[PDB]
Design a protein around this ligand. Structure first.
Ligand SMILES: [Mn+2]
Ligand SMILES: [Mn+2]
Ligand SMILES: [Mn+2]
Ligand SMILES: [Mn+2]
Lengths: 240, 240, 240, 240
């Protein structure tokens, strides 16, 4: 069971990913292609590189080039500081290879939108949000129900369970309408294992908190993954 | 002095603009190409169509295809409703022809980011925000100073003044970093008059209020144009 | 019945076409955007501009940006001069708006290939080549049969006849294999009248003779259009 | 000294190259992505894979997706068969990684054109053609002189000499005019070692003879590489 990705493996992975992005017209500047864009969700997932990203095997891994992550604090009424973290502007391109996933997780503050740039995205999610604290929350459009998963979705071994709660399915393609994923909703997507290209999608969402706009913003955790193993990973990718 | 755009003029304008968008890989669906995307800022500006969009003359006009404008209310703490309008997710592509402008204006709630897809964008703005009400506002990164205007920027006749306060300049190109324009800041951009293609840019910003997420969101005006004439226009484009 | 295209009409037509080209990644340099790229096939066809290129009306018109047209004479054996004209390298992008056609014609020397860049191309042609002279010609792969025309192909009024001989149909899309159109074959294509974007296609073919590589190449006519009217046009477009 | 490329190495190499192609809008169909597109020029060059394609090391290797290679025999006068091989239509996209080369070689029949799709191409060539046989050859535009090589062009070890005769230099970029390379001219290009993306270029040339349009076309060799070692390779790539 591999426990890390080699330097060559990582660089080629993010270097191909970077060029594929620019071609697809995304402003990926070298500053952004770094030892953090490449993500492996868990020590169990480093086996993704035992056969390669073109192996078509079910693993939790991806690359994320972030071009923007504006807090949007400036100009906001002082009385809005308490809730300023539920706002903000994040823009990032994500690259997922055939068969690979972006593990089941939900965000307390972040609300995301998806725009397929290349390939097809099989989105999985829970139509019901999670009750984060006894506090009262607003409603409006919520998350619709969606469709039944298509047959044959191979899930990473040992993470089979983390997908249970994500009953709703959705197939987003290039050209489709923008898809909104409200905070507090369990989501996860994958690139069809039999894809001919890597899934590529522009994520326009609210601020991305990653472990100072405001003092109370200091190291906030906004990523909550079902499978605990995934949590010990998103933090960084072990590169030899 | 023409006082409206003919049906053919408008359709060709938005239909070229629509195709140009899809080619540049923006998800412009026909639903979005409507009698509203095409905007003429003021009765004084319908003269843009006397010689055409490729006349290279200084006029205030543009097309905006909006793919997303999510309120981001769902999942927000009830106690955040008062400030929920300062958040939200808007995604739109804008097309500005050579010599044309997006008139001087500022938003009280909206914070924008720019990503040049095609061409070059000559951004003009005021380094100081405006004092909207006696209420207290937050700070953090603010707006940097920028550079002096390049010589020879022809401004639309009769609107010469509205650009005065926008002393800071900036030339954003394809590939450059995401450019953030904080709310309360006077902004305005143009496509260089001697351009060979239309300027095209992806605007990722906070919710765009246009004349119901929450009761108090009912018909909110978040667009404040310097030149009053521009105001009586953004509302709609007179098409014969 | 309009008998010419105005300067603004022409410029806007080729200027939108030019930018759409670069966006689709075709090397359209300004030298190429000239008073010749825009083509109207016959005086009967200037009525295309009566309602516009977005009229969706059946007319023979198009724009052709030629990036290459190499004779490929250098390095060729002296003994090959007689047949050097059937060789050469031409590279051009073509833009056809919804409902418009590229009139029925055949080339004696030129053999073309099509690559759909944007939109869909409805190709019409004759499965049998024409007997040009009593001279003996070679064979090999020839032109396959193809399919029946789909219902509802509106043809330009008065040119209805010139399409008779082109019984074979073919719908080429972006991604499809390269389609080869051998010389001596009657062809003509159009952009589906109900298209949402202009048809755009990369034509890679042999040398394009337009009214000196070799003395005998001096002003050669390699374009032979069925409808006589089309012939007196391809020469130039009447611009006011 | 590695003497072959592993299955995974090969696949990932061509799989990334294939998707990069489609993104840049080239019609790369799966049939085209095969155990031949990936090319290693010589057993001395398999060490390219010891550190990877992103090693930035000087090696002779590349991938070539061929979409068209029409003989253009059909419709040609019987009396033209002797010279039909100097004609034809080849269309292919080529992918060269940072620091890698396309070894010095010349073609007796083929004449090529280059169009940079992505990156920058540093083309090297000899301004004088080679005298292939006592036969007489035609002339017209020939090959201009060009420029001095830029300092610091690292050449693959052991092949340093094969570049000597290619004294003329040229830097072709996206948007530049079509570049024509006449047959009988020694050429070779590379992607700048410090490139951020792989060089990608559309090669539109005459028929590409690879070891039956006409009987005398049977297995013709039109590729003549300076370094002998390169010749024993282009034939096939050793994959474990
Ligand atoms: Mn997420
Ligand atoms: Mn604005
Ligand atoms: Mn033709
Ligand atoms: Mn060659």
């Amino acid at each position: 069971a591999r426990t890390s990705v080699t330097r060559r493996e990582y660089d080629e992975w993010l270097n191909e990913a970077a060029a594929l992005g620019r071609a697809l017209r995304y402003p990926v500047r070298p500053e952004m292609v770094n030892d953090s864009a490449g993500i492996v969700f868990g020590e169990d997932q480093y086996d993704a590189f035992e056969n390669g990203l073109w192996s078509r095997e079910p693993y939790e891994a991806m690359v994320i080039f972030e071009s923007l992550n504006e807090p949007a604090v400036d100009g906001l009424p002082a009385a809005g500081a308490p809730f300023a973290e539920y706002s903000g502007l994040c823009d990032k391109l994500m690259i997922v290879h055939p068969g690979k996933f972006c593990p089941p997780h939900y965000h307390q503050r972040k609300t995301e939108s998806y725009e397929v740039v290349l390939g097809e995205m099989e989105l999985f999610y829970s139509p019901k949000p999670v009750q984060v604290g006894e506090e009262e929350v607003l409603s409006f459009t919520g998350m619709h129900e969606g469709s039944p998963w298509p047959d044959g979705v191979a899930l990473p071994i040992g993470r089979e369970e983390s997908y249970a709660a994500l009953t709703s399915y959705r197939r987003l393609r290039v050209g489709d309408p923008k898809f909104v994923m409200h905070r507090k909703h369990l989501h996860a997507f994958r690139c069809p294992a039999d894809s001919d290209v890597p899934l590529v999608v522009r994520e326009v969402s609210t601020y991305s908190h990653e472990p100072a706009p405001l003092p109370d913003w200091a190291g906030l955790h906004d990523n909550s993954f079902v499978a605990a193993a995934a949590n010990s990973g998103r933090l960084r990718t072990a590169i030899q």
